[PDB]
Amino acid sequence: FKLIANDGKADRMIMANDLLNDRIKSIMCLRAKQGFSDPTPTLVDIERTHILLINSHYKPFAAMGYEYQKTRPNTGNPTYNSTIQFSIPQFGDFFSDMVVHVQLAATSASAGTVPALPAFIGADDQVLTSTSVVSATENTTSGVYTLYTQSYVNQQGTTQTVAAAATNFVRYCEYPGLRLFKRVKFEVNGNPLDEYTALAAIMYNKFHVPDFKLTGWKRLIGQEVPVEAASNLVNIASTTPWGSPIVALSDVNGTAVTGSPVNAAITARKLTQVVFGAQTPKATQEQLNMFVPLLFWFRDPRLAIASVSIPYGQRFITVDIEQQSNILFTAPGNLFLQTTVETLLTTGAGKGTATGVLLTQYNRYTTYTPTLASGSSIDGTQAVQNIELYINNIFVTPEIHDIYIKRIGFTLIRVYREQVQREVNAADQVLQSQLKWPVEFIYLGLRPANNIAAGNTYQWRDWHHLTSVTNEPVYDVSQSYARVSIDDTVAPVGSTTFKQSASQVMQNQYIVPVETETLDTVRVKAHGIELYAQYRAQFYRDYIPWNYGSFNLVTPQDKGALFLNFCLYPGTYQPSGHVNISRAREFYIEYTSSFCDSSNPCDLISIAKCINFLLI
Amino acid sequence: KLIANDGKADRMIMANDLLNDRIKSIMCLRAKQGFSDPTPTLVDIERTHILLINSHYKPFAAMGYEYQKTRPNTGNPTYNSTIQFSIPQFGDFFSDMVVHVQLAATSASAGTVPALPAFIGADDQVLTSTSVVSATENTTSGVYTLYTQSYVNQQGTTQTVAAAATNFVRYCEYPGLRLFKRVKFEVNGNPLDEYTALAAIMYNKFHVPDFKLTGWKRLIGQEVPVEAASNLVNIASTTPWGSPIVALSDVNGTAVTGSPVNAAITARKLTQVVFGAQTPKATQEQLNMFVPLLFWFRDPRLAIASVSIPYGQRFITVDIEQQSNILFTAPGNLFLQTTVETLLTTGAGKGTATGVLLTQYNRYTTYTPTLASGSSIDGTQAVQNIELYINNIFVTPEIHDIYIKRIGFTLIRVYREQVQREVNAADQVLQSQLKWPVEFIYLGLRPANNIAAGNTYQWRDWHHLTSVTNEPVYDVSQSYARVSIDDTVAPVGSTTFKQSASQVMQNQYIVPVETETLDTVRVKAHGIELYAQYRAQFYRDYIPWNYGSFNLVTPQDKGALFLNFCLYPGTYQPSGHVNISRAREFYIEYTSSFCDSSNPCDLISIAKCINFLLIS
Amino acid sequence: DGKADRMIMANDLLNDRIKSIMCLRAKQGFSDPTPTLVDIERTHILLINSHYKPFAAMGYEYQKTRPNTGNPTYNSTIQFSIPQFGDFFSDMVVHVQLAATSASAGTVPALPAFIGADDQVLTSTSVVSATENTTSGVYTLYTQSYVNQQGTTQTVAAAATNFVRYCEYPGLRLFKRVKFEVNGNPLDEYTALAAIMYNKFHVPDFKLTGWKRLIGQEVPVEAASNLVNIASTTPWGSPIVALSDVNGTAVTGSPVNAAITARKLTQVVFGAQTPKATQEQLNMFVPLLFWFRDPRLAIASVSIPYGQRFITVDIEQQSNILFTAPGNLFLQTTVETLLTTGAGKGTATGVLLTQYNRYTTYTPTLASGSSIDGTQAVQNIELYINNIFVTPEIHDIYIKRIGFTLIRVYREQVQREVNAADQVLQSQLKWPVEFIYLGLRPANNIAAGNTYQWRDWHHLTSVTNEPVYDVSQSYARVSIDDTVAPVGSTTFKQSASQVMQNQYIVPVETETLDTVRVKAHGIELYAQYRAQFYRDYIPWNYGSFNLVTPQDKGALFLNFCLYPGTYQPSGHVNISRAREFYIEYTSSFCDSSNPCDLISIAKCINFLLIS
């Protein structure tokens, strides 16, 4: 390797080594004539034109240290569905990031009973006991007798009696720490200095938690994390699980048989993902521990709030707590409805009925459905065992503190501004009347009202989704076959003494959450002037979060989360664009919907982050 | 209790005795110089010390942006054509660009069920319109082996040969990346910069971190996984296993290895499903893509002055791939059922179809998705819309005229690609495309078969830089059944106690196994070693891990290599390059364990070079 | 305008600055009165700005080096020279090559003991026992045997060979000790404990796959299945699809046609951690995690000359890197139940069989006398060094004017613990502390007797194994008399089977730390907080893309700076307090029966002279 510092026009413009060497010759000549003993230039002299890519320089920081502090509420024993207020103690010169520790008690569902059995299916041979319900459909024309059986069993398959004991399981909604804080408010002198609701908390969940922070984020707000599990070897090189008669076959023409398995080429095991946390239904949800961060601007250390700048008399963190019925839900436990259909094909007298003779073919089909126990609901006495505000307090030297107060003047801050408009229109133009400061960007969504409805059995999951979610089942079915000869003196091949039997049993069932988007197009208009033309919602959900923000902006998973951007660097502190209001009086967000109508009302959610100023 | 001045260590990191001296001095000068306030200025402190609590920012020269979409000058768009957009006159600058492509919903044409496979066995051959049956006698063992093959749909209903059948349709992986064969930024008739799908897949591998991946996939039409949860598989203190095998102990009291016990946790499984453009469907929905144009001027800092590239001579030209490389036929609801049955008789005629005393029966059943004959893609599928979206930046007139008169020039990065087809196991390939300083080079040796029409996995392998083979993984359902056919003799130890067993394919996965095509790579330029002969994992794993930070993603593709020559690939500030003298005689040397005359490969080399752009 | 826009953009100030400068330039006689971009940038920032500054000429090239200590082996000290090449040397990575290796031939072990007390038979292929029950008429038969994957029964004492696997992250455990020697004295050094703290905290997802490939961790491969859902059809037979009861209501548990067309994805692994008959040659590029990996902090070769600079790697034993695992050998456990109703019911001679049931599991089993190859060679080991070159003019200025460089060093202490709560003095802290990795790893995680040591060795919690079963369920009915109506008859036989289709092992983590408290020279730096504060909140809040929230439930981060991972210092623990530094813990797991290691790895600030 030889370094080449000056090769033509390209190197002259990128490295400028001829100039750099000329600057050195000039600087050493001036220092020498001016009487310096050391004529070699200073590193600053070089840095006035050229950057040094190898450089160990740094600056000393004004002496600084920090320490967290727990604080209990002024409002006594904490409960669900209440307002909890913390004082911001006088401790550090500044206070910065905050996080609230919430402790929810271990809880179980009340005792219930096995519900009544389903109604009859077939019109014939109806029998109802305490343990099963049996009906049948005859068909003497085809000779097929269909028998319907439904019963209740546990996981091991033991039949459960109607009205016997049964207990539902309990689960927390997804992201319960985000839904638990109905409203979070930082107020000084009676008025809210900044505030946000659970809609902002879930907007943050979708746009500002990259994967290198996700596992801890999920743990802070009570969302279970998946755990990877490894299986036995499913492929072993040079062998196969298939029996020999079907392996490595060739047809009569020498060609390998389509559908004939061959030996595996690699040795591999399977990975599966399991969850067993707050969102998985359990007989007893263990004590839930969450550390909910407060998503205020001053979480940034550079933006730490000077303690003397706010009186201790009226400075508070005030949190409205969601109700338990929106956080904890019952779910089916160790109780399953077994639905079995059996077909018996007879060919003799009475065929198609229960008295038909000569059974040639038998088939069984069976599914299992998790079932709710009657009268088993959540424990309403579940205690909020502990809640405490953690405040990071920063300390500085007395000299710098006095200089900082007298010379800082003000600080640039960011605040939330929320508006929710109920809609039954497929298309509408919604004046944004809570938007009233320089807006950097707006989170936008059209959440169906059913996502938060107590009648939606999937509210625990759908509440934070911004789309209409339907549930598509995926079945794992075990197929079996069996043939048996009942006459040891007659050849089975081609005889009715060569019986047939088959079975399809449900092995497991998955639920695919299928999102149907609620926004087709979005338009942003201010005083009859387009800020954003009518573009497909996919432009705001996919392209804008992809192009802007760097690691501060995450492309959202939710198909309904949209980002109306007005700045060049959405995550950074340095201002880089806004829409002032200002002539923003008539600020309109116009949408088109293929989902929203009178039968499917939705909430147009628009949350903006605005710039304001705090004078210290 | 802050400390600030504990020893030499605190003296060099915080320098608090120095800072106090500077403050005490500054207060005395200002007092001596007649200032009303002697306390220093934050700038005065920051000339030596850095302030960790600082809300300072600089005002930005007023600017705002707005997107504008335009249609091509070349009329109705089609596959296999050139589409050209003019860049309209709108803002003072134009920046990031994205192209909306809309492909009509499409399905395959009607076909037929193909002919059944040939005979497997030599005996008892029967050909039906609905099944093909053969057999293999074995009088020595008494085993009659019966082979049956037929066609079924998903529900299992038999399909008649030459009856109706329709194939499904699928898109190739990353359709938005392959759709654009070439993308041109044209000025004065000269290509100012251009790239291919090869550069697009290099970007897909190296510059899409996980916090941008979901949105990136949606922009280019790649399906996104959807996580689905199952029923509870583990329930604390119970089991799915029947009691006779649960928690057994041997005669010595030790727990039986292989005897399952109750579960200790309660868990669900998570599986992932896809159902988008790449999943075969009877009808693929209207595919909407917003394909970003990966030019350098996507950076807002590097927006192009509208005056410096005049209107009327600036164009975006896009070459569109043929339809047959984007949309593909895949098997529909038609499956080949492969069944082997073995009959173990012991009486007269054992091993033939006339065997009498049947003792054991086995059935083995696999299913293979099958293409219908004469069912192909719709060649009239229209490109329903294509529009270029351009971000337009507006600035004040005062700063505009100052910047255009003073910036002089701007650095740009341009693609420079070369593809050399190889049948040599090792070769030294002169890189003739290189004319300018090179920051880094994307490298790969892609097998020609990955883009060959004869490859039925071309829809998937086209962007892979290795040789991919397909390894089946079988989910097998095993069943057993035993029945006594004589109620007067005990079953145990009697031939009246018949046996039956079945193995049915429940599902099958395809594992894409990558075989690396590059063993070692060496970089030699102007008779100078810039990279010695190093293993391919050095360029694939080590270099992307060490350099680039969040701007350089470690590639999943095992054949993606990154030859770096700068310290910070991904930043605008230059940080190293290969100079033009060496770039004009530049060699990339490889050794391969795969490439030979039976496996031709293309050595793809795409360098990112530095050039310049004058202003007006 | 107005007020808000005057403070964010100050455009009326900017225009007045422009008007002022253009006039003063005209007053002073400048030919071009239009302002300079610098003059604008003294107050306002230019969001569109293609300006850059030229860098002093500099290039880099890597170099490969073989060790001074002869042929490399396991369980040995390997030392490298740092050759003289560039003016500075920077990032380092070590290529390790481990030979392809297989287990020695062994045998099929002895069959298990009898389960039932009756009808006990032992052959070379199976062990059979039975439990009678004349009261219920159920005769239970137990059969255990060895098979391969295809189900072919294996004979006791016949040939059988174990597979081999590597521990997880073999590149991190192989380098038992990595140290940078300068003039005899270790300038900085770390262990595998520091390497796995980097694994948990400093590898974000955009670097994860290559990291795993660098240190020998297998990477999952996504695999797609056939279609499982097809719109407007179903896999279920007609008799159970879309049923309605007698009231017209759709039947609960009756499947309907699929609404979407979807296929499944699953992940498979088949690398160094997956057991194989032959583990092919393993190639790792293990990076050395020293501070001077940052190009800016590259070490001047003149200040640390050749001959007095070395990289020394202590290599772990093979028994901690390579392990045996079950091969193509499985124990089949089968239970059959025969309910008879006639004479001799509940015994082997009972007549009238109405119900048959079979339960069958398979457990992967080790072959006897099949162990790892102790002669497996370290086929190659080489040090890669990035060498940085500069012009002679700037090197001269830089060596005379830089003075010193701040460096960071690892300081580690391991404390064997049997107390449920303790106050542990951190006696290894010489220098200012930026942050501390904390962990309480059970001694059983690195125990030779722990069959899961290949996996648990780097975990900081107590790990237990929870099976998850895939079970195939079957049913069969047969009429054995063609003259009797089957419904309601004992001639209508019943049969059912549960067969294990697969089995997963879920690693269940039990945290070993409940609360942590930090006391230093009589000062509380951290009150007694829950472990989840240090594992979840602190890594989430701090560090940006340089601090990853750890997956390990036992990884704790004791932070004392504002920007961990960045070169510019942003907070530390003064040395006075560091000399009397205590970490007080509370544990639900550690006791006299469960020893644990309190692992504390501090990152400290140190200076380094130049020239």
Side-chain angles (χ1 to χ4, degrees), chain B residues 1-22:
Chain B
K1 313 179 193 168
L2 196 53
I3 296 191
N5 56 3
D6 182 69
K8 166 187 292 190
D10 283 345
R11 191 165 309 113
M12 300 165 59
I13 302 176
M14 294 174 298
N16 194 62
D17 289 288
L18 169 60
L19 182 61
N20 285 333
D21 288 330
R22 298 204 45 242

PDB file of all heavy atoms in Angstrom, chain B residues 1-22:
ATOM      1  N   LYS B   1     -24.661  14.818  46.247  1.00  0.00           N
ATOM      2  CA  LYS B   1     -23.342  15.391  46.492  1.00  0.00           C
ATOM      3  C   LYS B   1     -22.445  15.267  45.264  1.00  0.00           C
ATOM      4  O   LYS B   1     -21.797  14.240  45.061  1.00  0.00           O
ATOM      5  CB  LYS B   1     -22.674  14.714  47.691  1.00  0.00           C
ATOM      6  CG  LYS B   1     -23.570  14.557  48.906  1.00  0.00           C
ATOM      7  CD  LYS B   1     -22.829  13.861  50.035  1.00  0.00           C
ATOM      8  CE  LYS B   1     -23.783  13.412  51.128  1.00  0.00           C
ATOM      9  NZ  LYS B   1     -23.117  12.483  52.087  1.00  0.00           N
ATOM     10  N   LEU B   2     -22.416  16.316  44.446  1.00  0.00           N
ATOM     11  CA  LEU B   2     -21.502  16.361  43.315  1.00  0.00           C
ATOM     12  C   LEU B   2     -20.078  16.615  43.808  1.00  0.00           C
ATOM     13  O   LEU B   2     -19.857  17.174  44.885  1.00  0.00           O
ATOM     14  CB  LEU B   2     -21.942  17.444  42.327  1.00  0.00           C
ATOM     15  CG  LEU B   2     -21.368  17.442  40.909  1.00  0.00           C
ATOM     16  CD1 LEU B   2     -21.560  16.090  40.243  1.00  0.00           C
ATOM     17  CD2 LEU B   2     -22.022  18.540  40.085  1.00  0.00           C
ATOM     18  N   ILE B   3     -19.100  16.190  43.007  1.00  0.00           N
ATOM     19  CA  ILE B   3     -17.710  16.188  43.456  1.00  0.00           C
ATOM     20  C   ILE B   3     -16.846  17.102  42.593  1.00  0.00           C
ATOM     21  O   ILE B   3     -16.197  18.020  43.109  1.00  0.00           O
ATOM     22  CB  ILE B   3     -17.150  14.755  43.480  1.00  0.00           C
ATOM     23  CG1 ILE B   3     -17.908  13.917  44.512  1.00  0.00           C
ATOM     24  CG2 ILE B   3     -15.668  14.774  43.788  1.00  0.00           C
ATOM     25  CD1 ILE B   3     -17.269  12.580  44.815  1.00  0.00           C
ATOM     26  N   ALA B   4     -16.794  16.822  41.288  1.00  0.00           N
ATOM     27  CA  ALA B   4     -16.220  17.707  40.273  1.00  0.00           C
ATOM     28  C   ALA B   4     -14.693  17.748  40.245  1.00  0.00           C
ATOM     29  O   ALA B   4     -14.106  17.882  39.166  1.00  0.00           O
ATOM     30  CB  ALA B   4     -16.760  19.132  40.437  1.00  0.00           C
ATOM     31  N   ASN B   5     -14.030  17.649  41.396  1.00  0.00           N
ATOM     32  CA  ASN B   5     -12.584  17.870  41.460  1.00  0.00           C
ATOM     33  C   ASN B   5     -11.889  16.772  42.260  1.00  0.00           C
ATOM     34  O   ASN B   5     -11.092  17.038  43.163  1.00  0.00           O
ATOM     35  CB  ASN B   5     -12.271  19.242  42.054  1.00  0.00           C
ATOM     36  CG  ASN B   5     -12.901  19.450  43.421  1.00  0.00           C
ATOM     37  OD1 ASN B   5     -13.536  18.550  43.971  1.00  0.00           O
ATOM     38  ND2 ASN B   5     -12.720  20.641  43.978  1.00  0.00           N
ATOM     39  N   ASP B   6     -12.156  15.513  41.921  1.00  0.00           N
ATOM     40  CA  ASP B   6     -11.532  14.382  42.608  1.00  0.00           C
ATOM     41  C   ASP B   6     -10.398  13.845  41.741  1.00  0.00           C
ATOM     42  O   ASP B   6     -10.593  12.967  40.898  1.00  0.00           O
ATOM     43  CB  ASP B   6     -12.555  13.299  42.927  1.00  0.00           C
ATOM     44  CG  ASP B   6     -11.948  12.129  43.675  1.00  0.00           C
ATOM     45  OD1 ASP B   6     -11.572  12.309  44.853  1.00  0.00           O
ATOM     46  OD2 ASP B   6     -11.838  11.034  43.084  1.00  0.00           O
ATOM     47  N   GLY B   7      -9.199  14.385  41.953  1.00  0.00           N
ATOM     48  CA  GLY B   7      -7.997  13.817  41.379  1.00  0.00           C
ATOM     49  C   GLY B   7      -7.740  14.222  39.940  1.00  0.00           C
ATOM     50  O   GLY B   7      -8.437  15.040  39.337  1.00  0.00           O
ATOM     51  N   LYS B   8      -6.686  13.615  39.384  1.00  0.00           N
ATOM     52  CA  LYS B   8      -6.300  13.883  38.002  1.00  0.00           C
ATOM     53  C   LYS B   8      -7.366  13.407  37.024  1.00  0.00           C
ATOM     54  O   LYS B   8      -7.595  14.043  35.987  1.00  0.00           O
ATOM     55  CB  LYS B   8      -4.956  13.217  37.699  1.00  0.00           C
ATOM     56  CG  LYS B   8      -4.610  13.146  36.219  1.00  0.00           C
ATOM     57  CD  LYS B   8      -3.354  12.326  35.966  1.00  0.00           C
ATOM     58  CE  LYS B   8      -2.114  13.020  36.506  1.00  0.00           C
ATOM     59  NZ  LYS B   8      -0.866  12.348  36.051  1.00  0.00           N
ATOM     60  N   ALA B   9      -8.026  12.289  37.335  1.00  0.00           N
ATOM     61  CA  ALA B   9      -9.056  11.758  36.446  1.00  0.00           C
ATOM     62  C   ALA B   9     -10.169  12.774  36.224  1.00  0.00           C
ATOM     63  O   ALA B   9     -10.525  13.083  35.081  1.00  0.00           O
ATOM     64  CB  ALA B   9      -9.617  10.457  37.019  1.00  0.00           C
ATOM     65  N   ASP B  10     -10.727  13.312  37.311  1.00  0.00           N
ATOM     66  CA  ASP B  10     -11.757  14.337  37.188  1.00  0.00           C
ATOM     67  C   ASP B  10     -11.212  15.643  36.631  1.00  0.00           C
ATOM     68  O   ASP B  10     -11.993  16.471  36.151  1.00  0.00           O
ATOM     69  CB  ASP B  10     -12.418  14.586  38.543  1.00  0.00           C
ATOM     70  CG  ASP B  10     -13.416  13.508  38.909  1.00  0.00           C
ATOM     71  OD1 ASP B  10     -13.812  12.736  38.011  1.00  0.00           O
ATOM     72  OD2 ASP B  10     -13.818  13.440  40.088  1.00  0.00           O
ATOM     73  N   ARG B  11      -9.894  15.846  36.683  1.00  0.00           N
ATOM     74  CA  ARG B  11      -9.309  17.064  36.133  1.00  0.00           C
ATOM     75  C   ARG B  11      -9.311  17.047  34.608  1.00  0.00           C
ATOM     76  O   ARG B  11      -9.474  18.097  33.976  1.00  0.00           O
ATOM     77  CB  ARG B  11      -7.888  17.246  36.667  1.00  0.00           C
ATOM     78  CG  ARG B  11      -7.277  18.607  36.387  1.00  0.00           C
ATOM     79  CD  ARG B  11      -6.037  18.834  37.242  1.00  0.00           C
ATOM     80  NE  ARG B  11      -6.297  18.574  38.657  1.00  0.00           N
ATOM     81  CZ  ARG B  11      -5.751  17.578  39.349  1.00  0.00           C
ATOM     82  NH1 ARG B  11      -4.900  16.749  38.762  1.00  0.00           N
ATOM     83  NH2 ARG B  11      -6.050  17.416  40.632  1.00  0.00           N
ATOM     84  N   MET B  12      -9.129  15.873  34.004  1.00  0.00           N
ATOM     85  CA  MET B  12      -9.043  15.760  32.553  1.00  0.00           C
ATOM     86  C   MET B  12     -10.393  15.547  31.879  1.00  0.00           C
ATOM     87  O   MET B  12     -10.517  15.806  30.676  1.00  0.00           O
ATOM     88  CB  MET B  12      -8.103  14.612  32.171  1.00  0.00           C
ATOM     89  CG  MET B  12      -6.683  14.793  32.681  1.00  0.00           C
ATOM     90  SD  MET B  12      -5.716  13.276  32.600  1.00  0.00           S
ATOM     91  CE  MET B  12      -5.790  12.920  30.847  1.00  0.00           C
ATOM     92  N   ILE B  13     -11.398  15.088  32.618  1.00  0.00           N
ATOM     93  CA  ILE B  13     -12.708  14.795  32.053  1.00  0.00           C
ATOM     94  C   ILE B  13     -13.665  15.969  32.210  1.00  0.00           C
ATOM     95  O   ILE B  13     -14.483  16.227  31.326  1.00  0.00           O
ATOM     96  CB  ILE B  13     -13.284  13.516  32.698  1.00  0.00           C
ATOM     97  CG1 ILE B  13     -12.336  12.337  32.478  1.00  0.00           C
ATOM     98  CG2 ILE B  13     -14.650  13.192  32.123  1.00  0.00           C
ATOM     99  CD1 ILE B  13     -12.785  11.064  33.155  1.00  0.00           C
ATOM    100  N   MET B  14     -13.575  16.694  33.321  1.00  0.00           N
ATOM    101  CA  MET B  14     -14.461  17.820  33.582  1.00  0.00           C
ATOM    102  C   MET B  14     -13.747  19.157  33.689  1.00  0.00           C
ATOM    103  O   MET B  14     -14.349  20.179  33.351  1.00  0.00           O
ATOM    104  CB  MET B  14     -15.266  17.574  34.868  1.00  0.00           C
ATOM    105  CG  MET B  14     -16.230  16.408  34.754  1.00  0.00           C
ATOM    106  SD  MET B  14     -17.046  15.991  36.304  1.00  0.00           S
ATOM    107  CE  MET B  14     -15.635  15.532  37.301  1.00  0.00           C
ATOM    108  N   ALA B  15     -12.493  19.178  34.142  1.00  0.00           N
ATOM    109  CA  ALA B  15     -11.689  20.398  34.222  1.00  0.00           C
ATOM    110  C   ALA B  15     -12.438  21.505  34.960  1.00  0.00           C
ATOM    111  O   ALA B  15     -12.612  22.618  34.459  1.00  0.00           O
ATOM    112  CB  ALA B  15     -11.258  20.859  32.828  1.00  0.00           C
ATOM    113  N   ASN B  16     -12.886  21.187  36.176  1.00  0.00           N
ATOM    114  CA  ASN B  16     -13.726  22.122  36.915  1.00  0.00           C
ATOM    115  C   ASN B  16     -12.919  23.238  37.565  1.00  0.00           C
ATOM    116  O   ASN B  16     -13.434  24.350  37.725  1.00  0.00           O
ATOM    117  CB  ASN B  16     -14.543  21.376  37.971  1.00  0.00           C
ATOM    118  CG  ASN B  16     -15.672  22.219  38.529  1.00  0.00           C
ATOM    119  OD1 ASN B  16     -16.574  22.628  37.798  1.00  0.00           O
ATOM    120  ND2 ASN B  16     -15.633  22.476  39.831  1.00  0.00           N
ATOM    121  N   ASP B  17     -11.670  22.970  37.950  1.00  0.00           N
ATOM    122  CA  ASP B  17     -10.824  24.047  38.455  1.00  0.00           C
ATOM    123  C   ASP B  17     -10.472  25.033  37.351  1.00  0.00           C
ATOM    124  O   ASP B  17     -10.326  26.232  37.616  1.00  0.00           O
ATOM    125  CB  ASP B  17      -9.554  23.477  39.087  1.00  0.00           C
ATOM    126  CG  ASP B  17      -9.824  22.774  40.404  1.00  0.00           C
ATOM    127  OD1 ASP B  17     -10.109  23.471  41.401  1.00  0.00           O
ATOM    128  OD2 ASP B  17      -9.746  21.529  40.444  1.00  0.00           O
ATOM    129  N   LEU B  18     -10.338  24.553  36.113  1.00  0.00           N
ATOM    130  CA  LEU B  18     -10.111  25.452  34.988  1.00  0.00           C
ATOM    131  C   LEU B  18     -11.355  26.275  34.680  1.00  0.00           C
ATOM    132  O   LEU B  18     -11.267  27.489  34.458  1.00  0.00           O
ATOM    133  CB  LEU B  18      -9.676  24.653  33.760  1.00  0.00           C
ATOM    134  CG  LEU B  18      -9.650  25.386  32.416  1.00  0.00           C
ATOM    135  CD1 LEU B  18      -8.693  26.566  32.459  1.00  0.00           C
ATOM    136  CD2 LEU B  18      -9.278  24.426  31.295  1.00  0.00           C
ATOM    137  N   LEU B  19     -12.525  25.631  34.662  1.00  0.00           N
ATOM    138  CA  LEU B  19     -13.760  26.337  34.333  1.00  0.00           C
ATOM    139  C   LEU B  19     -14.079  27.410  35.368  1.00  0.00           C
ATOM    140  O   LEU B  19     -14.514  28.513  35.015  1.00  0.00           O
ATOM    141  CB  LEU B  19     -14.917  25.346  34.215  1.00  0.00           C
ATOM    142  CG  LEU B  19     -16.277  25.933  33.833  1.00  0.00           C
ATOM    143  CD1 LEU B  19     -16.211  26.592  32.464  1.00  0.00           C
ATOM    144  CD2 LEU B  19     -17.347  24.854  33.866  1.00  0.00           C
ATOM    145  N   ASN B  20     -13.873  27.104  36.653  1.00  0.00           N
ATOM    146  CA  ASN B  20     -14.092  28.105  37.693  1.00  0.00           C
ATOM    147  C   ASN B  20     -13.175  29.305  37.501  1.00  0.00           C
ATOM    148  O   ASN B  20     -13.594  30.453  37.690  1.00  0.00           O
ATOM    149  CB  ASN B  20     -13.881  27.487  39.076  1.00  0.00           C
ATOM    150  CG  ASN B  20     -15.028  26.591  39.497  1.00  0.00           C
ATOM    151  OD1 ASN B  20     -16.166  26.777  39.065  1.00  0.00           O
ATOM    152  ND2 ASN B  20     -14.735  25.617  40.350  1.00  0.00           N
ATOM    153  N   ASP B  21     -11.917  29.059  37.124  1.00  0.00           N
ATOM    154  CA  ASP B  21     -10.994  30.161  36.870  1.00  0.00           C
ATOM    155  C   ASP B  21     -11.451  31.000  35.685  1.00  0.00           C
ATOM    156  O   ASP B  21     -11.308  32.227  35.692  1.00  0.00           O
ATOM    157  CB  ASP B  21      -9.583  29.624  36.632  1.00  0.00           C
ATOM    158  CG  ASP B  21      -8.938  29.102  37.899  1.00  0.00           C
ATOM    159  OD1 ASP B  21      -9.255  29.626  38.988  1.00  0.00           O
ATOM    160  OD2 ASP B  21      -8.110  28.172  37.806  1.00  0.00           O
ATOM    161  N   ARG B  22     -12.004  30.354  34.654  1.00  0.00           N
ATOM    162  CA  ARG B  22     -12.500  31.101  33.504  1.00  0.00           C
ATOM    163  C   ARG B  22     -13.712  31.947  33.876  1.00  0.00           C
ATOM    164  O   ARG B  22     -13.841  33.088  33.420  1.00  0.00           O
ATOM    165  CB  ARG B  22     -12.837  30.144  32.360  1.00  0.00           C
ATOM    166  CG  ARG B  22     -11.644  29.354  31.852  1.00  0.00           C
ATOM    167  CD  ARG B  22     -11.846  28.885  30.418  1.00  0.00           C
ATOM    168  NE  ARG B  22     -12.380  29.948  29.572  1.00  0.00           N
ATOM    169  CZ  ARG B  22     -13.560  29.890  28.960  1.00  0.00           C
ATOM    170  NH1 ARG B  22     -14.321  28.813  29.088  1.00  0.00           N
ATOM    171  NH2 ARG B  22     -13.972  30.904  28.212  1.00  0.00           N
TER     172      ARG B  22
END
